[PDB]
Structures are given as structure tokens and as C-alpha cells.
T-cell receptor, first 113, second 114 residues
Framework: DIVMTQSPDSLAVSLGERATINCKSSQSVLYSSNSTNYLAWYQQKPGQPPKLLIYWASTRESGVPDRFSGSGSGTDFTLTISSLQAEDVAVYYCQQYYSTPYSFGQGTKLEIK | DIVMTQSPDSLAVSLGERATINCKSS????????????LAWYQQKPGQPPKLLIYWASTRESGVPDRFSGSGSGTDFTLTISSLQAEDVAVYYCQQYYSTPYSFGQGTKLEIKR
């Protein structure tokens, strides 16, 4: 199947500064028919289930602040936070839903410096 | 890793009738410390990513109509739809997020019996 790997497992940045989380798929998740990457990013604050943040690799889900943005294609993707805020402290997960079983990466813990 | 299996892979019922999709986990996702199940249900329509429908096994997400309700505990869960409506036609997936890697079931196609 498709294995997803993230990097790092955790990281910290000062409030106000940028942060980037990387994710690699063991296989391509690009659907050529409509040239789209079936990749998503989830935000998980402790005490809550994972919440959809970004899909199609770069499309933010409604409600998500414009400071979150996704990029990448094929097998390498990145989640970018332009200005870390207190509420952004959480564990992020990338996921591919190109072929079943849909799979997640191991997760990356984001914290404040 | 925990393995999620659903039954059946596809099914159909008449509009206004009930439908049930089952999901098994190879290992319990019941969390003893809080006695809650780390189980979720998603609805996926064509051209869109799966969308969170239910979490904690029975908590309905915001905006989700009461026709949808989840049940089960440990390793056996069930998604129920009391009155099938045309917009409920989609593929449903269960997910465990008790222990990484979080995982999905193979998906169940819900169709309208004409």
C-alpha cells in the first residue's frame, strides 16, 4: 500500500515565526485525470480527534486561517505556518486518500520556543 | 498497527428507509483512562475529500443531521442512517485514531434502491 512518512517528529519555533512540516509518500498520490494530489493535512489538539486542515495538497478547508498553506506534488509535500500562534500548538498529520486503505503519516508535534 | 474492516463493501436501501454499515478493528480502540472510543466516521462524495461525520464513535459533528448516528464499543461499531435521503449517497469510511498510524476501513458504498 501507500506508506506516508513525516519529518521531523516534532519541532518548536518562537511565536510569530514560520514553521514547516514535511511529508513523503512511498508512492505517487497524483491523479492525472484532473491533475490533482489526493493529499490532506490534519490538525490535532490533545483531547480532540484529528481535524481536516488542508486537502488536494494546497486547498485550505473552510474556516482555516490563511496563515496555513500546503505545497508539493507527486511524493513530497509540506505544510507551512507563516506565523505560529498559541492556538496552532498541536500535532499535525499528512494523509493520502488516492488508494485504499487511506493512510496517515506518523505525525509531527508543533510547539512554542 | 490496527486494522479496520467494514461490512459490506457496498449496499442499497430505499429512500426513507434505514441503512447500517459495520466496522471491525483488529484491536480495541476503547481508551480505559477515559472510557471513550477513538473511532470516527467519514462521508466521501465524488470530487471531494472524505469529510468528518462522527467522532468518539457516537458524537455527531456540527451541521450533521440527526439521521446519522454511530454506536458500538471496543472493536465493533455501526453507522446508522434512519431515513435515507438522496444526498446520503456516498462512500463511508470508519477510522481509528487510538494509536498511530491512524487507519481507515476499506470503504462502503451507499446507494439508493430504485
Amino acid at each position: 500500500d501507500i506508506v506516508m512518512t513525516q519529518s521531523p517528529d516534532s519541532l518548536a519555533v518562537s511565536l510569530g515565526e514560520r514553521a514547516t512540516i514535511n511529508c513523503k509518500s512511498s508512492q505517487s498520490v497524483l491523479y492525472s485525470s484532473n491533475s490533482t494530489n489526493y493529499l490532506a493535512w490534519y490538525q490535532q489538539k490533545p483531547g480532540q480527534p484529528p481535524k481536516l486542515l488542508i486537502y488536494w495538497a494546497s486547498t485550505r478547508e473552510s474556516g482555516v486561517p490563511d496563515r496555513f498553506s500546503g505545497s508539493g506534488s507527486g511524493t513530497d509535500f509540506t505544510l507551512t505556518i507563516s506565523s505560529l500562534q498559541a492556538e496552532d500548538v498541536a500535532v499535525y498529520y499528512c494523509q493520502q486518500y488516492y488508494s485504499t486503505p487511506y493512510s496517515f503519516g506518523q505525525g509531527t508535534k508543533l510547539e512554542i520556543k | 498497527d490496527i486494522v479496520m474492516t467494514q461490512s459490506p463493501d457496498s449496499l442499497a436501501v430505499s429512500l426513507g428507509e434505514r441503512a447500517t454499515i459495520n466496522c471491525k478493528s483488529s484491536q480495541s480502540v476503547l481508551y480505559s483512562s477515559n472510557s471513550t472510543n477513538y473511532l470516527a466516521w467519514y462521508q466521501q462524495k465524488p470530487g471531494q475529500p472524505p469529510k468528518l461525520l462522527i467522532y468518539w464513535a457516537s458524537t455527531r459533528e456540527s451541521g450533521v443531521p440527526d439521521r446519522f448516528s454511530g454506536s458500538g464499543s471496543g472493536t465493533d461499531f455501526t453507522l446508522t442512517i434512519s431515513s435515507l435521503q438522496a444526498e446520503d449517497v456516498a462512500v463511508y469510511y470508519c477510522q481509528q485514531y487510538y494509536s498511530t498510524p491512524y487507519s481507515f476501513g476499506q470503504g462502503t458504498k451507499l446507494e439508493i434502491k430504485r
